[PDB]
Design an enzyme around this catalytic site. Structure first.
Site, short mmCIF file in Angstrom:
data_model
loop_
_atom_site.label_atom_id
_atom_site.label_comp_id
_atom_site.label_asym_id
_atom_site.label_seq_id
_atom_site.Cartn_x
_atom_site.Cartn_y
_atom_site.Cartn_z
N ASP A 1 -6.69 -12.58 3.80
CA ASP A 1 -5.24 -12.54 3.72
C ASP A 1 -4.63 -11.70 4.83
O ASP A 1 -3.53 -12.00 5.30
CB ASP A 1 -4.80 -12.01 2.35
N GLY A 2 -5.33 -10.65 5.27
CA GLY A 2 -4.85 -9.87 6.39
C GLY A 2 -4.78 -10.67 7.67
O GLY A 2 -3.85 -10.51 8.47
N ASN B 1 4.61 -10.07 1.99
CA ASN B 1 4.14 -9.39 0.79
C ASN B 1 5.20 -8.43 0.25
O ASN B 1 5.83 -8.72 -0.77
CB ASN B 1 2.83 -8.65 1.05
N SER C 1 5.09 -14.00 -4.04
CA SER C 1 3.67 -14.09 -3.70
C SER C 1 3.06 -12.73 -3.40
O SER C 1 1.84 -12.57 -3.50
CB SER C 1 3.47 -15.03 -2.51
N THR D 1 0.99 -9.97 -6.36
CA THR D 1 -0.43 -9.77 -6.63
C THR D 1 -1.06 -8.72 -5.72
O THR D 1 -2.25 -8.42 -5.89
CB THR D 1 -1.19 -11.09 -6.51
N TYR E 1 0.24 -4.99 -3.47
CA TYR E 1 0.59 -3.60 -3.77
C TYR E 1 1.46 -3.50 -5.02
O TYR E 1 1.34 -2.54 -5.80
CB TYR E 1 1.30 -2.98 -2.58
N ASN E 2 2.35 -4.48 -5.23
CA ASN E 2 3.18 -4.50 -6.43
C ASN E 2 2.35 -4.41 -7.70
O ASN E 2 2.70 -3.69 -8.64
CB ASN E 2 4.04 -5.77 -6.44
N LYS E 3 1.22 -5.13 -7.74
CA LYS E 3 0.39 -5.14 -8.93
C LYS E 3 -0.19 -3.76 -9.22
O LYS E 3 -0.27 -3.35 -10.39
CB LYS E 3 -0.73 -6.17 -8.79
N1 LIG Z 1 -9.46 -6.57 -1.42
N2 LIG Z 1 -8.47 -6.53 -0.58
N3 LIG Z 1 -7.48 -6.49 0.26
C1 LIG Z 1 -6.26 -5.74 -0.08
C2 LIG Z 1 -5.17 -6.72 -0.53
C3 LIG Z 1 -4.86 -7.72 0.58
N4 LIG Z 1 -3.81 -8.69 0.21
C4 LIG Z 1 -2.95 -9.18 1.08
BR1 LIG Z 1 -2.95 -8.74 2.93
N5 LIG Z 1 -2.11 -10.01 0.49
C5 LIG Z 1 -2.45 -10.04 -0.80
C6 LIG Z 1 -1.93 -10.73 -1.90
N6 LIG Z 1 -0.89 -11.54 -1.75
N7 LIG Z 1 -2.50 -10.55 -3.10
C7 LIG Z 1 -3.53 -9.73 -3.25
N8 LIG Z 1 -4.05 -9.07 -2.23
C8 LIG Z 1 -3.53 -9.19 -0.99
#
Ligand SMILES: [N-]=[N+]=NCCCn1c(Br)nc2c(N)ncnc21
Ligand SMILES: [N-]=[N+]=NCCCn1c(Br)nc2c(N)ncnc21
Ligand SMILES: [N-]=[N+]=NCCCn1c(Br)nc2c(N)ncnc21
Ligand SMILES: [N-]=[N+]=NCCCn1c(Br)nc2c(N)ncnc21
Lengths: 264, 264, 264, 264
Positions: free
Chosen positions: B45-46, B122, B158, B161, B163-165
């Site tokens: 995702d990064g 994010n 989106s 899931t 940092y918000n979580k």
């Molecule tokens: N294990 N790990 N990586 C840390 C989290 C990386 N991350 C990113 Br960037 N976007 C999201 C995302 N939308 N939902 C969950 N996690 C994400």
């Protein structure tokens, strides 16, 4: 037009109701508690909830108004001192209306009981009849989790400031057509796993609860709570019906949130 | 059409990228990292977030695709073994697209600095430069609360899931056009008061952060984090721009949530 | 010495029990379920809890041992494969003992009912009989808060990994003589106020629950749950009695926590 | 005996300090800020914390007293109007003393830096220098978890009402010799796992933090915060040293909790 007024039953609310009825007599306003177009609640949010459920079969022809005789309420959000001014604009007709989404609950049984549907303004909760509460949570026909704990709570947007808030749920603006599911003391370990976070679902998403062992659940809808036997499924979804409020001045939801929880 | 591929940089992702480029040569597909219509991310995702921010000025002419070489990601949600099948339908054209909402962040300063706007996929967070973090939270020109604590986090749907979580926020379906504000270790007592609950705001709602004493804040937007000086206001609102994904098969968001947090 | 063995009742636990009884016959060990000095539980933590409450009037002359036939338990923390080795050192005498604190619960009524006292190994909870749950919390004869919500939970140290954990409570080492109070979905606003945080009390501190309107409460003690009528006070304090375990090898509490909740 | 007084520095606290010094002149009391036996703090809890750290090498020969010129504090818990009465009994000698436990922090480096030890009255926190914070948590030489998130907080009993409280920690009575570890926005999924719950450790238990990739951490001890380079281990344990307060009347900790967080 036709109208009616419900009262909390105490001395303050009954006398305010009689005063508004007398004021309505000075206008072309007919009292009718069978087919009213305007339903006025005097008391608290609980008084408003009863008024909502008393006329939940004519929600599309009723504009609700809530008056709080005690502390500020999220539905009864007009002080008693504004009652006379409320009568004038209410009888003058010509007012804008605001609509909030509702939650539809469907309970299915085995042979012998017909499918029962309920309409909630705040939230619907599920607990066990006595033993441990274990259900499988299915989201749009997809198995999501096996929940073990005290219970679950599905909330309307306007209901998020009630029981949903006490369970860690988020407060969402009532203009968002959605529903929010929260957990009640879920057990989590290496063998049993739940999401933990609250979930917010849009329209047309169906969240289903299916029993694992016990088929008896204590199901609540707002203030009503009934023990259901031989349950095969509990079905949650945003209702196609909405509750309509009569709008006479700007009282923003976030200001209502601030006055109730921060200070006023 | 024009396309490009970004890689995480490791040996697994670079070789998968070269394989897809070779496969694209068998079709009418032109490699262009200046004006691509298809942007493919390979890694995590990064890696996808960097690809998003590299082309955030042509979001309306780009359909993104994410491929995860490691664990499943919420944006990179296609396994490497599906790369060849991805090339065929990507070059065949004719595919449906899915759009997610974005968060707009506006930072205003005093004399000397121009207003700066950022676009987050994010979330955006605010912390203090070193001392205590205290800001006034204003919702649609209405003072809501004076926040004291570690900081605040405003998340996209989106982004819930991520940092918000971790901050107790709710997970909301990305089809809901909204943004969610969460608190970071807020101090609460008889003198200092915050709402505590996460807040979900719809479109056209403006949430403003205004300093009380210190005017320096560490502001983050996704992976980028910069110390801002002489800040007069931080402005959050749902962006009018959306990110477009190329859709080649059904991978429901709630299934993606289940695979990442429950089991897979 | 005198001993006895309780079984979960399933096929695995009954046959393991018969095997240990046969093994004990090879030593100077007398089976006695009336005055045993060694009580062995085979099954889960629930099987151990029943064994504890069956002999809670001779806790000072009994050393308990728990054997888990299923997943690892915090009290039944010995695998079935160690049963034969358990018999040898158990009959050899000469073993060290570990003691855990217990919770004392006192329920007072009006005229007609005698004061009832209970002893809990995990926790004691209080809920309402049906309506809203409202009680005043008094700490050492000092009014601390008026609690409104679903209920309250007072936990032993070793009980913190059970229901206490699901309510946000802290996990404390069982060598600390204390008790922990946690809240169940407390309602908080500008008019109603609770501490929110869990509270940890040392020995000789008395926490008292006193009714406001309804005097009927559903009180639980471990697995037992009874509806109490005409309640005047609920009194919590760390018990002067302790439960004694037989120690045959080092199984640290924090390792037991790690194996149950992190991985094993 | 020898005494000294620290002031917050504002006009209210400086003049109260001069008044107490003048009052002490009417008794056999010598002002000495080098070897005082009585240290009086005037201001807030932050003023008290500075007074504690100024004399943390003679804690066994000093009885502290806190006076709050603003809101009530947990250490500065005497109103300015009681200053004159405080002078009399302070100079009369003959007063009882109350002792609170402290937290010992040990930071180990590689070659070039000597092991550094710190003493905290409230708490010690660890965050990353900039990148992601990942550490292995070892409890009594046993690997417990790999923590990923914003950071960790280890609190004294009396420090539980400060930063610990904002992170969900439990409030424990300061007579319990323990320390409490809490998490800061931990990331949890199918691959990364933390306990989540706060942990309470007794005396002689050693909690160790060990780096995984980055060896630079921002370590705080009460109000002091320093970036540490080339860190090999962070070691937490309940200190063998205690802070001694002068006791002149009953102000129970739970009453102090109620006045600060419920109402006063
Ligand atoms: N294990 N790990 N990586 C840390 C989290 C990386 N991350 C990113 Br960037 N976007 C999201 C995302 N939308 N939902 C969950 N996690 C994400
Ligand atoms: N104090 N009190 N009463 C208990 C809560 C009653 N309540 C009802 Br009904 N609806 C709501 C609501 N939408 N938001 C907050 N509170 C509500
Ligand atoms: N899965 N499961 N069973 C539900 C929990 C049963 N349980 C009992 Br009884 N005592 C404990 C305990 N001390 N710690 C954790 N869990 C416990
Ligand atoms: N409002 N304010 N100040 C921020 C908190 C200052 N503080 C200090 Br220092 N010690 C404590 C303590 N033991 N309990 C609560 N608060 C404390």
């Amino acid at each position: 037009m036709k109208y009616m007024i419900t009262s909390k039953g105490d001395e303050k609310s009954d006398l305010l109701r009689l005063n508004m009825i007398a004021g309505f007599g000075e206008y072309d306003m007919e009292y009718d508690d069978v087919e009213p177009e305007i339903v006025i609640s005097i008391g608290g949010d609980g008084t408003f909830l009863s008024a909502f459920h008393q006329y939940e079969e004519r929600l599309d022809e009723i504009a609700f108004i809530g008056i709080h005789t005690g502390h500020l309420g999220f539905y009864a959000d007009w002080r008693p001192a504004e009652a006379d001014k409320l009568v004038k604009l209410l009888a003058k007709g010509e007012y804008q209306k605001v609509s909030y989404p509702l939650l539809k609950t469907t309970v299915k049984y085995g042979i012998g009981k017909k499918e029962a549907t309920y309409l909630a303004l705040n939230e619907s909760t599920v607990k066990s009849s006595g033993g441990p509460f274990v259900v499988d949570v299915v989201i749009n026909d997809i198995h999501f989790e096996r929940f073990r704990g005290d219970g679950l709570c599905m909330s309307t947007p306007s209901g998020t400031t009630a029981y949903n808030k006490s369970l860690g749920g988020a407060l969402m603006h009532p203009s968002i057509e959605a529903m929010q599911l929260t957990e009640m003391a879920s057990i989590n370990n290496r063998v049993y796993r739940t999401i933990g976070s609250p979930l917010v679902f849009p329209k047309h998403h169906v969240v289903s609860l299916q029993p694992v062992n016990d088929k008896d659940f204590q199901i609540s809808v707002d203030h009503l709570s009934i023990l259901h036997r031989d349950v095969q499924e509990i079905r949650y979804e945003v209702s196609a019906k909405k509750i309509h409020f009569a709008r006479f001045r700007s009282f923003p939801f976030w200001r209502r949130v601030h006055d109730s929880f921060i200070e006023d």
